[PDB]
């Protein structure tokens, strides 16, 4: 059964609630983004209205074969009416197509559901600036002060500089980047741009990327692995055994691998600066873990909430343990006392 924090009171709506069967009272199912923990349950046999972004609806139709008549894509930054209720979709700064949803309830209550997001000051100048928000359904993934990480721009600077140096020293080095979901495309696109290469990948991953409205994409990606010196592999293959095996398949074209695993946070964040990150090495294989996050750090999350000043916060992540819930509630109260709302 569907948990309360996936239900929008005073509507017939749910958010990211496709794994519970037919939800009683639900007239419209919203999907914030195409990540499996959130779409779990959708397929060609789904026959209720799904509301989402254009990019998300391309993925639903092409990857999961949801029939077109049930996909309701909405433009961003535009007031729309769904089953009698005004809604707006806003960019979540998460993966491609990911949205936050503003609901304007018939009784005057305003609710923001962030989906998954990486808070940014640029959100302080969207349509959120224009009215009060009463209830916030918040992505609390990294809601603890230990979770610090660098800007996405610092991380990509590190990656491009690392790759360009390695391949200029050894033109027979191959670069490999791990992936298992959409998101974090900048990692492999920025490294291929500095090297003058396309990114090579499986037909299944190429298909996924072609749903994303990324500009000039036919110019940056390919299924012809032989023509590319940046390859994408599944995340599970980014280890010494998997990479040794891949290097064998390349037929003596290459004699070294430099590989990147874009994780979110790891405890090497609490001690070490990005500039100071070093790889794990075995023979002619090196593996870099880089802290490229598509979720808010603690400080970014606190700044957003202290700006928005909601009356009530409902966490949507880390809600399964009493210790996690009590921790999060204590920071919410600190934030409110410090800012004065």
Give the residue with the Cβ less far from Ni ion, 35 or 205.
35
Q: Smallest gap, in angstroms, from Cβ of residue 35 to Ni ion?
A: 4
Q: Smallest gap, in angstroms, from Cβ of residue 246 to Ni ion?
A: 27
Give the residue with the Cβ less far from Ni ion, 35 or 302.
35
Give the residue with the Cβ less far from Ni ion, 116 or 300.
116
Q: Smallest gap, in angstroms, from Cβ of residue 264 to Ni ion?
A: 10
Q: Smallest gap, in angstroms, from Cβ of residue 36 to Ni ion?
A: 9
| Binding site residues, Ni ion, CB under 5 A | 35, 116
Q: Smallest gap, in angstroms, from Cβ of residue 94 to Ni ion?
A: 6
- What is the pairing mode between strands 135-138 and 110-113? parallel
Give the residue with the Cβ less far from Ni ion, 38 or 231.
38
- The two tokens of residue 195 are 């090297």
Q: How many CB atoms lie within 10 A of CB 208?
A: 20
Q: From residue 3, how far is each of 14, 20, 29, 272, 324 by CA, in Å?
A: 10, 9, 14, 39, 17
Give the residue with the Cβ less far from Ni ion, 222 or 293.
293
Which pairs count as long-range contacts for 193-199, CB under 8 Å and 24+ apart, including other chains? Answer: 193/160, 193/220, 194/160, 194/163, 194/164, 195/163, 195/164, 195/167, 195/229, 195/230, 197/228, 197/229, 197/230, 198/222, 198/224, 198/227, 198/228, 198/230, 199/228, 199/230, 199/231, 199/232
Q: Smallest gap, in angstroms, from Cβ of residue 306 to Ni ion?
A: 24
Which residues, at least 6 apart from 235, have a Cβ–Cβ distance to it below 8 Å? 178, 179, 180, 261
Query: Buried b vs exposed e over 62-98: b needs ≥16 C-beta within 10 Å?
Result: ebeebeeebbebbeeeeeeebeebebbbbbbbbbbbb
Give the residue with the Cβ less far from Ni ion, 116 or 185.
116
Which residue from 284, 278, 279, 318 is spatially nearest to 301, judged by alpha carbons?
318
Q: Smallest gap, in angstroms, from Cβ of residue 41 to Ni ion?
A: 16
Q: Smallest gap, in angstroms, from Cβ of residue 333 to Ni ion?
A: 27
Give the residue with the Cβ less far from Ni ion, 182 or 258.
182
Give the residue with the Cβ less far from Ni ion, 166 or 314.
314
- Cβ-contact 102, 128 below 8 angstroms: yes
Which residue from 114, 45, 107 is spatially nearest to 301, judged by alpha carbons?
114
CA-angle at 334, arms to 331 and 336, nearest 5° = 110
């Amino acid at each position: 059964t569907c948990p309360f924090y996936k239900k929008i009171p005073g509507t017939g709506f749910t958010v990211d609630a496709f794994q519970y069967g037919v939800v009683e009272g639900c007239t419209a199912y919203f999907l914030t983004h195409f990540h499996s923990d959130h779409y779990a349950g959708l397929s060609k046999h789904f026959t209720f209205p799904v509301y989402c972004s254009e990019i998300t609806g391309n993925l639903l139709k092409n990857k999961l074969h949801v029939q077109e008549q049930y996909i309701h894509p909405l433009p961003l930054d535009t007031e729309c009416i769904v089953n009698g209720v005004k809604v707006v979709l806003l960019d979540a700064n998460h993966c491609p197509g990911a949205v936050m949803i503003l609901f304007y309830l018939p009784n005057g209550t305003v609710i923001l559901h962030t989906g998954d997001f990486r808070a940014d000051p640029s959100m302080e100048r969207s349509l959120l600036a224009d009215q009060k928000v009463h209830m916030l359904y918040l992505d609390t993934t990294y809601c603890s002060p230990e979770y610090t990480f660098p800007s996405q721009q610092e991380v990509i600077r590190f990656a491009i500089n690392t790759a360009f140096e390695a391949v200029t020293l050894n033109p027979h080095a191959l670069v490999v980047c791990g992936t298992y979901s959409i998101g974090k495309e900048k990692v492999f696109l920025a490294i291929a741009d500095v090297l003058g290469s396309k990114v090579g990948m499986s037909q299944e991953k190429y298909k996924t990327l072609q749903c994303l409205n990324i500009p000039e994409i036919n110019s940056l990606i390919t299924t012809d692995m032989c023509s590319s010196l940046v390859h994408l592999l599944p995340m599970m293959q980014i280890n010494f055994k998997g990479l040794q095996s891949h290097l064998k398949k390349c037929g003596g074209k290459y004699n070294q691998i430099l590989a990147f695993r874009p994780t979110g946070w790891t405890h090497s964040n609490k001690f070490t600066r990005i500039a100071d990150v070093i790889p794990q090495t075995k023979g002619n294989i090196s593996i870099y873990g880089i802290p490229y996050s598509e979720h808010s750090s603690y400080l970014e999350m606190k700044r957003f909430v202290q700006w928005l000043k909601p009356q009530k916060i409902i966490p949507t992540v880390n809600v399964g343990t009493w210790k996690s819930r009590s921790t999060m509630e204590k920071y919410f109260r600190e934030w409110k006392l410090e800012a004065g709302y």
